[PDB]
Ligand binder design. Structure first.
Ligand SMILES: OC[C@H]1CNC[C@@H](O)[C@@H]1O[C@@H]1O[C@H](CO)[C@@H](O)[C@H](O)[C@@H]1O
Length: 315
């Protein structure tokens, strides 16, 4: 039962998972550092590529992504360090279009620029990596991330998930974007509801009640498969924006984490936090004060999180 899952104190690693990058000594060192934090989970996240948001072809595997061996190598390392592992393949667009906005002028037809064709490629990709997750003992598999335009294609999502279930016996989640939790119609097909909970600092309190209602309505636990904030000025107001025009501001990131932890209640429907994110090439701690990324390492947010996560664990 998903209801039995230990509360998640997690971190996403390695995105976007470019070929060869996880096979490095730098990546192994970065994973060792991640496991020294009070985390019980890591998510191995990487992205295949679509040429454009209206092209149904998806390039995955070498030379674009980390190899299956690289995946296995990082999973084995994480497991040897006592972490549970979620595998999260997703898709990006080479022109930089958000995957939540992919669009096809046609619905059906495998050889056409259609949703049917796109789901064919996507499902091939997910089926392959579900098998990898099974062969490498990954405790969770994430079947999608922020696919807002794809979500209404419910029958096709259910087809995708059914195929994943034949290839993989562990926990399955789908990760919707913030504000989509109540709109997704196939939560029954997965084990855990999850979201990219990039809520601005001032929105947390008002949003919790809907999160509770979604979990209770669907009789499923809910967690955050992504949550985080860049350490840049003003970023707390738009935590999802990774190219925010502002100077480094460590305290802003720490303010995001305080607001989130202050808002979330200690209730059974809520299963925790998969933080965004940790790089395969980790900067020295000294260099932290100069870093504007989502990474919390070496920053005041590291302590806010440690304090919060250590309190949870040692309870
Ligand atoms: O802005 C933070 C997240 C929100 N959810 C999806 C994810 O893609 C996004 O991360 C950025 O991802 C891009 C690549 O798609 C990467 O260039 C950035 O450095 C962030 O990791």
């Amino acid at each position: 039962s998903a209801f039995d899952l230990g509360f998640i104190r997690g971190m996403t690693f390695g995105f976007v998972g470019q070929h060869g990058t996880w096979g490095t000594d730098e990546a192994r060192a970065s994973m060792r550092a991640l496991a020294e934090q009070p985390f019980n989970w890591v998510t191995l996240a990487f992205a295949g590529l679509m040429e454009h948001p209206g092209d149904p072809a998806i390039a995955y595997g070498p030379p674009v992504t980390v190899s299956d061996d690289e995946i296995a190598s990082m999973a084995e390392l994480a497991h040897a360090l006592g972490l549970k592992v979620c595998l999260k393949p997703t898709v990006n667009c080479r022109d930089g279009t958000w995957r939540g906005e992919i669009r096809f002028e046609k619905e059906h037809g495998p050889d056409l620029e259609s949703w049917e064709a796109w789901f064919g490629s996507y499902s091939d990709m997910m089926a392959h990596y579900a098998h990898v997750a099974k062969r490498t003992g990954c405790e969770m598999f994430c079947v999608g991330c922020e696919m807002t335009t794809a979500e209404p294609h419910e029958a096709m999502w259910r087809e995708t998930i059914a195929r994943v279930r034949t290839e993989y016996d562990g926990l399955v989640t789908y990760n919707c974007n913030h504000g989509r939790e109540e709109h997704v119609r196939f939560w029954d097909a997965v084990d855990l509801i999850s979201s990219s909970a990039y809520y601005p600092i001032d929105r947390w309190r008002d949003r919790v009640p809907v999160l509770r209602e979604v979990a209770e309505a669907h009789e499923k636990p809910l967690f955050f498969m992504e949550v985080g904030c860049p350490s840049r000025s003003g970023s707390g107001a738009c935590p999802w924006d990774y190219r925010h025009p502002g100077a480094v501001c460590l305290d802003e990131q720490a303010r995001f984490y305080e607001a989130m932890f202050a808002a979330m209640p200690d209730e059974p429907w809520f299963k925790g936090y998969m933080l965004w994110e940790w790089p395969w090439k980790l900067y020295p701690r000294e260099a932290a004060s100069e870093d504007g990324s989502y990474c919390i390492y070496g920053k005041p947010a590291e302590d806010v999180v440690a304090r919060a996560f250590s309190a949870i664990a040692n309870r």
